[PDB]
Symmetry: D2
Subunit: 286 residues, 4 copies
Amino acid sequence: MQPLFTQERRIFHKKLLDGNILATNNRGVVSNADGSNTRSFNIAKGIADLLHSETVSERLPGQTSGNAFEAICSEFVQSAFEKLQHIRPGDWNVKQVGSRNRLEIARYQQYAHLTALAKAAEENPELAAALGSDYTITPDIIVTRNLIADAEINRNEFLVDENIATYASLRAGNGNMPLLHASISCKWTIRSDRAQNARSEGLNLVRNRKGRLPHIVVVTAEPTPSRISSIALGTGEIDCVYHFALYELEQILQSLNYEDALDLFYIMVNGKRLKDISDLPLDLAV
Amino acid sequence: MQPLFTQERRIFHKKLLDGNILATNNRGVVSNADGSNTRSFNIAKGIADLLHSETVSERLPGQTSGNAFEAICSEFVQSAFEKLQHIRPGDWNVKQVGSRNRLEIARYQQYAHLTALAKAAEENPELAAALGSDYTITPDIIVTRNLIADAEINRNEFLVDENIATYASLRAGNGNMPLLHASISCKWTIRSDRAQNARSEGLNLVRNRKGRLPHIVVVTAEPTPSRISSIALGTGEIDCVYHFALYELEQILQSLNYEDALDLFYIMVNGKRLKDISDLPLDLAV
Amino acid sequence: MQPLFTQERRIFHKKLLDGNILATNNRGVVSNADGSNTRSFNIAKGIADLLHSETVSERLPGQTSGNAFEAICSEFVQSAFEKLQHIRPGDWNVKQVGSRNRLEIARYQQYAHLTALAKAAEENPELAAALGSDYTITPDIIVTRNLIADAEINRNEFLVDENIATYASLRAGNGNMPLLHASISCKWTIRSDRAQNARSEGLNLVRNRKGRLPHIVVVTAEPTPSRISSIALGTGEIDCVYHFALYELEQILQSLNYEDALDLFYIMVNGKRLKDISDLPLDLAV
Amino acid sequence: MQPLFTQERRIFHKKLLDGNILATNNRGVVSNADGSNTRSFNIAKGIADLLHSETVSERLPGQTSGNAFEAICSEFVQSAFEKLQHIRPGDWNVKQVGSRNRLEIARYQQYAHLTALAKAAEENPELAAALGSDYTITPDIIVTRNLIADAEINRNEFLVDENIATYASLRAGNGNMPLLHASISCKWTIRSDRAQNARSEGLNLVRNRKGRLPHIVVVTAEPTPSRISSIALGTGEIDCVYHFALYELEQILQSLNYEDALDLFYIMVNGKRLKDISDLPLDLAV
DNA sequence: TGCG
DNA sequence: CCGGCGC
DNA sequence: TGCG
DNA sequence: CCGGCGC
DNA sequence: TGCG
DNA sequence: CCGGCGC
DNA sequence: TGCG
DNA sequence: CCGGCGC
Ligand SMILES: [Mg+2]
Ligand SMILES: [Mg+2]
Ligand SMILES: [Mg+2]
Ligand SMILES: [Mg+2]
Ligand SMILES: [Mg+2]
Ligand SMILES: [Mg+2]
Ligand SMILES: [Mg+2]
Ligand SMILES: [Mg+2]
């Protein structure tokens, strides 16, 4: 009897395999590997073997794997988090955003004022130069919480009426919007330069919030500890990073005796900067 | 009224009145007012009248009122938040800490590593000069969450076992500590210089976290919108400020026709920077 | 006592003595000490003795000493920095900002846009609820650099004309404002809570600048290493702290056997977080 | 005679052309353009014509253009800044730092302590989890200042000896190392995701400094105002961005009547977020 | 080369 | 480090 | 189409 | 968005 | 009159 | 702005 | 205590 | 920690 989160984790991997997102080409290179690097090549191959990947196909265009990885991550989060309603109740929505959504975050309570800022800037110069446009934050995946009725708040006891706790964020109707619960950034693979946009997006969420900061996490299928470390090490922007196949990564590093990579892997794991994709749903329930 | 949060809000005010924390001296100065300040005096008197305050006594020493205000705010939050278990379940603890101990936050999961940094600085001077020492400063009041047993996670379904979600923060078992849910800073009265330690303490919680940022809020009995604004305006450090008698403050500003102060009050309230103490328990449930 | 900076340092101390800013009251408490604190009391008296202080006077009101300390520090900086024209040329101005605080900062190039932000907010609601108000920063003392004419830029060679380097900050020309060189915060004495406004003011200068960040320093007469450390330890907001009588503080710490204070003193000094007032003029020439 | 800075700007451009860094391929795509983007293609062609580019050759590998652009920008800054000794005297060094040099930054005074942090982490595995690792990242190009002899400080008057201003940063004494004057980040072209490492690197310089923050700027050859805005808008990390051919960009934007892009250009330029490469040497002299 |  | 290009 |  | 690969 |  | 002193 |  | 009050 495999527990349900183990079953969900396997379903997550299976979607990556069935869609040929994770596969091997005819030159033996696994699709999340950097073929110019011996350790990346071998680590990725070991992980794919542990995942029972058998398909041989050409590496998909990066735009395709990028988008598909976001979608599959979203489905896994939605399905697993749904089972935690008893430890973190709520009317939750999980969705892949899509760069098409400029100001999508302004539809949520903690960032609704960005609409007013944007509207004011579209009429004022150094307002625009000073405020910027990055505040136009667009997470890859977001988890949101819908507001609740007074009868839900009062389900067991008469706690509130219309003249008390009148600005509480959870109360529906104050002309109020849903709450942003989490920003989940996805990276199929990593290069240390381009991975830093997870930090700038995290800082924008920190700097502009009105209310509690959403969870800010990164999920990645990057095989190398060194590249993972470019976003996982350090604190202040990113809450934690989650690897798509942590157990398998650990097993391959141990098997091949890649001592330095192993040392770095444990610095991140023991240092609470890196976890497995299966840890994410429960971490979203704190 | 009869809603329980309304009763609890009154119990909070009554504790302040009964302990002479909020009282009026024989010169007519209410104890949360700046007697040299005309508007402070009048706004504070208006609020005391709406709270039905009648006791005449000398102002208590600032150390006494500061500590009592923290204690009374702690009791209000504990009492009210306990009623929201169906909206935000968990084994919650609310406690007044402050200077009773430094590095108290290192007792919690997201800041556990500060103990190691302090030990390292203890053996290497420099580290101390670069790392600083203020990361050891404890919030006036903290709300914490104890960890969960597998029996509870698996209350309705078989979700986890020892080989899946092994790093999830909520799971009890590997020396992992409880989670810090909220930092609640209290200020009986405000001066714009000394109010800024709430921003530096908030920034330290932001910069050093591993995991989701706790709620970071300030509760105050300061009567003037100008002084309240010295900590409520701006974003990035403080989630929101909660006033001890917001409805009364609004009413008196209207009655006195202090138009500029009323305008600032509304900028803060409509701008989601200022709410009533009764909004805090529900805001801790998002 | 031959070199001019040594003579200037002595003049600085003499102004503090002559104005009764630094004096000893009837209870033997020196005016920069906390009489309830044995270490503060003894350290401050030792320093006063090394400065050859003999005046007895009751302690000046804090508003008076705060303002006088700012004025005297400003005069020391102006006089000493004036002698470094050969290593840091320019048309420099040093001034205690004072009462006409708000937006003086916006007269300078790197922060001129703050005026636009303030005007916009005035004509409309929230904006200030997001943007805040503390950005109308008012440093205690500022050092500014006036702009240069082409004749000077082209003193030795024909480097520029009207069609090249047209946006260079240093070029005098309708529209261009003087540059803010330094923000010098003064604190006659310190309490750990109120000292934090130096960090928030420093962060505002960092976050809102257009151009190179000005020097951000703090000058203080606080006698105890513990209180000095509440602003000197750590990095990110304050470049460095300068003590009004560092050599004397070190000598008395050596004589008194307060080993924890001596250790803290050296962590800050060896750690480049604390220097002497005489180091400031040269540090402003980098 | 054309001004020497105008002549320097032309030499800068000539080096880009002679090395085929900036050229046009046989399909009409200029080497700093995004061939798939009509507006990018046209703007880049317009600029190339204004620089009188006539060479037809295939685009160089990105690694090649990236390194060459760094080298060429370094040579321009060194040559032009050397002519400003009368406005900003000193013993200056300008050098392209190879990604082949981590902790080169710790060779400089304001960041020397990073070596001690790195050694502490090497023996305290785990500390790296919190401290991070990128704090060892060195800028693409750095400008540094050697320390000054007391002979020069005392050139005209006897200002200092060994018992006064003993911790001054400029004094070639306290084992003190040279000072970091500027961090110059280069980007031949931009994509909004990879442009963000300039912000994370800038933040590391802000957060870890002891002393005055160095200049932090970006130089780019990106043709589109939209992509330039991904790094130029906003304040706090980057002092200002400098475009390799600003005058030409503006001219072609007008000739093609790209209204939105022109609006954005002026917002960045009037908003002091974007200047010409010719403005950089003088801006480094403030 | 490795990784920016 | 930058370039290509599919969603 | 343009752009993450 | 990710992938290739030269300094 | 009220910030610092 | 700084000072006093109960916590 | 000295400090928050 | 807050209170007093000069500038
Ligand atoms: Mg994204
Ligand atoms: Mg992504
Ligand atoms: Mg506190
Ligand atoms: Mg407090
Ligand atoms: Mg000040
Ligand atoms: Mg001051
Ligand atoms: Mg670089
Ligand atoms: Mg670069």
